[PDB]
Symmetry: C3
Subunit: 85 residues, 3 copies
């Protein structure tokens, strides 16, 4: 149990390295966990309201549907600044 | 950019970077190709409260539909819909 | 508007063989449907409360967001016991 503090998760995605990405719908955040990895990272998305779906591409770009704000946001690998689709 | 989304649920991205979104509140699935500024509504019909979306290596799009009732498959090229 | 609820998502995933993975809220389970099998396989997850999402990685490992239990579970292909992440 290496996900910490998850609440009512909405969605899951897995990339080519086995990294798991989860929408923590109840804490308005998106978390990831490497394969066998001990502690999670919170992704630097901002201003989310009920993130719901998640997907990840072969470049490690993470896409999330920000349900409560009627939009979709993405975060490039290693970026601290999302963009809005 | 996406326009007029309402209460979106699932998202999927294929190996070309094209992003598919279940626009759950509007009973449709939309896609946006990498670099395009025009979203496309896929030719599903009859959807109500769709949620999850997936896309296979071939471009067949799968959507959960009518809450827990069904999964609808849209075949690449033909756009034939069938129920899983 | 004293009452405002959210609808829990439903998930679908597809592997490299075209096998389709589906959440089934009503039976609190995740099933898999191989192309032209006429066979619905119930995956041996345990103790699910309204699975909200499913993903499958290149090795056939199946990941599920267990919405009502604030957790993510996984099953490697052929495995009998889920791992909680």
């Amino acid at each position: 149990h290496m996900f910490t503090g998850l609440n009512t998760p909405h969605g899951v995605a897995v990339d080519s390295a086995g990294t798991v990405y989860v929408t923590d719908h109840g804490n308005n955040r998106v978390v990831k966990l490497a394969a066998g990895s001990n502690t999670q990272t919170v992704l630097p998305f901002t201003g989310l309201n009920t993130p719901s779906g998640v997907a990840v591409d072969s470049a490690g770009t993470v896409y999330v549907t920000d349900h409560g704000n009627n939009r979709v946001v993405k975060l490039a690998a290693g970026s601290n600044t999302q963009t809005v689709l």
